[PDB]
């Protein structure tokens, strides 16, 4: 029973950051040596755990979170970070125990495109590992908006341009966040 890591990383298309996909992984043997020792990753930052010793540990559950963001915003996927994405789209807890993996995807997700979205307006910051997919019109004034965009009424979602002619910071970056769970329940995700 091989853990479906390839489904997450090698997916044909990714989800937008505001509706980031999460893959629950359980009851399988995990071979991370296929994942690391493979290069092609521009950023592989691990917190609290070592990917080197990941092949001989047992975890209750493993989560793989997939989304596409700009290169400038990759730094926001880190504990204690702040920004549009860290506050309104995807938040990591300060005690995050996992790895953040990103790589440039200008070849795949950039069209001379306009399909990846991010949340631009929100009244409060996101709690860690919280998913918000609301498309309700953001009310910036005392006047109710009645679901129609206008003055003091903005659509909370904005779309990345993702043009191949943009700079490296503007280029799309597929990001996969690995979160490891160690509940008291019998461990189901181990390695060789």
């Amino acid at each position, epitope marked *: 029973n091989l853990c479906p890591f390839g489904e997450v990383f090698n997916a044909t298309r990714f989800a937008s950051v505001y509706a980031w996909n999460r893959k629950r992984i359980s009851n399988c043997v995990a071979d991370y040596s296929v994942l690391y020792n493979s290069a092609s990753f521009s950023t592989f930052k691990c917190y609290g755990v070592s990917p080197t010793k990941l092949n001989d540990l047992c975890f209750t559950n493993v989560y793989a979170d997939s989304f596409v963001i700009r290169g400038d915003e990759v730094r926001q996927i880190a504990p204690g970070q702040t920004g549009k994405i860290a*506050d309104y789209n995807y938040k990591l807890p300060d005690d995050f125990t996992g790895c953040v993996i990103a790589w440039n995807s200008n070849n795949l997700d950039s069209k001379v495109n306009y399909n990846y979205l991010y949340r631009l*307006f929100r*009244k*409060s910051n996101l709690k860690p590992f919280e998913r918000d997919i609301s498309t309700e019109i953001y009310q*910036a*004034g005392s006047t109710p908006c009645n679901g129609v965009e206008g003055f*003091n009424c903005y659509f909370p979602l*904005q779309s990345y341009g993702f043009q191949p002619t943009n700079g490296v910071g*503007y280029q799309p970056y597929r990001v996969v966040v690995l979160s490891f769970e160690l509940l008291h329940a019998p461990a189901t995700v181990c390695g060789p």
Partner: antibody, heavy 117, light 108 residues
Framework: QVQLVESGGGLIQPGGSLRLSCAAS????????MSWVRQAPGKGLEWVSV???????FYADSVKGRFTISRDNSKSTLYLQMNSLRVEDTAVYYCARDFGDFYFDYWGQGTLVTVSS | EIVLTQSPGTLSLSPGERATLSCRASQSVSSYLAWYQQKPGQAPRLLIY???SRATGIPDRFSGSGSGTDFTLTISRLEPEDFAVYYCQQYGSSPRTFGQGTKLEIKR
């Protein structure tokens, strides 16, 4: 209608402290991006600070560690605390309503801050 | 820190003509540009956001164009006033930066 009225500017010796208020009308301050933009006399416009709708605050390097941005929902006012003031900071500070940390669709009347001995 | 260069530094035209202003960037910003008008003794007023979208109440005679590195603000049918220091602001990469300005004066 949107109104942005500023106050608190004036003469302050270098190294002093100054705080400016920005009364806001026509929108809720707690739910919008707000920024302070200063313009040196005879120079261009410089971005100083921004406060997000979620309360996140970001500052420019030239004022980082010295300027603090804050809001008071109960008084619908945006504040800018200027500590460790320098002569170079002398400029006209504008209060601008930021649209998603991108551009300023409404600006205050502007108040002059003069920092000299 | 992306730097925005505006040309010309100052432009003068008679009323009724067309004024063209250019804003060039250090790096591509992908149409994430805004234009402002600042009459003397007044606050900056938003003119065009997204390098092509006119703001509320802005007359149709104002028009924006361009993307990436080169941008152009075109004003036609120049009436009385309508001449000020026009600023271009980019919001592609933080920190956000302005242009040095392009002063406009009428002719008589």
């Amino acid at each position: 209608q949107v109104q942005l009225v500023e106050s608190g500017g004036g003469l302050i010796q270098p190294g002093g402290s100054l705080r400016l208020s920005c009364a806001a009308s026509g929108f809720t301050v707690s739910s919008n991006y707000m920024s302070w933009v200063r313009q040196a006399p005879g120079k261009g416009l410089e971005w100083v600070s921004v406060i997000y709708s979620g309360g996140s605050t970001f500052y420019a390097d030239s004022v980082k560690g010295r300027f603090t941005i804050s809001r008071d929902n109960s008084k619908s006012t945006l504040y800018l605390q200027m500590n460790s003031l320098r002569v170079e900071d002398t400029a006209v500070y504008y209060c601008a309503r930021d649209f998603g940390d991108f551009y300023f669709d409404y600006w205050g009347q502007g108040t002059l801050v003069t920092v000299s001995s | 820190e992306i730097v925005l260069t505006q040309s010309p530094g100052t432009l003068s035209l008679s009323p009724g003509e067309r004024a063209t202003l250019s804003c060039r960037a250090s790096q591509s910003v992908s149409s994430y540009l805004a234009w402002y008008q600042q009459k003397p003794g007044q606050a900056p007023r938003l003119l065009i956001y997204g390098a092509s979208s006119r703001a509320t109440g802005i007359p149709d005679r104002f028009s924006g164009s361009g993307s990436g590195t080169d941008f152009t603000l075109t004003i036609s049918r120049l009436e009385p006033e309508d001449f000020a220091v026009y600023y271009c602001q980019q919001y592609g990469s933080s920190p956000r930066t302005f242009g040095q300005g392009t002063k406009l004066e009428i002719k008589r």
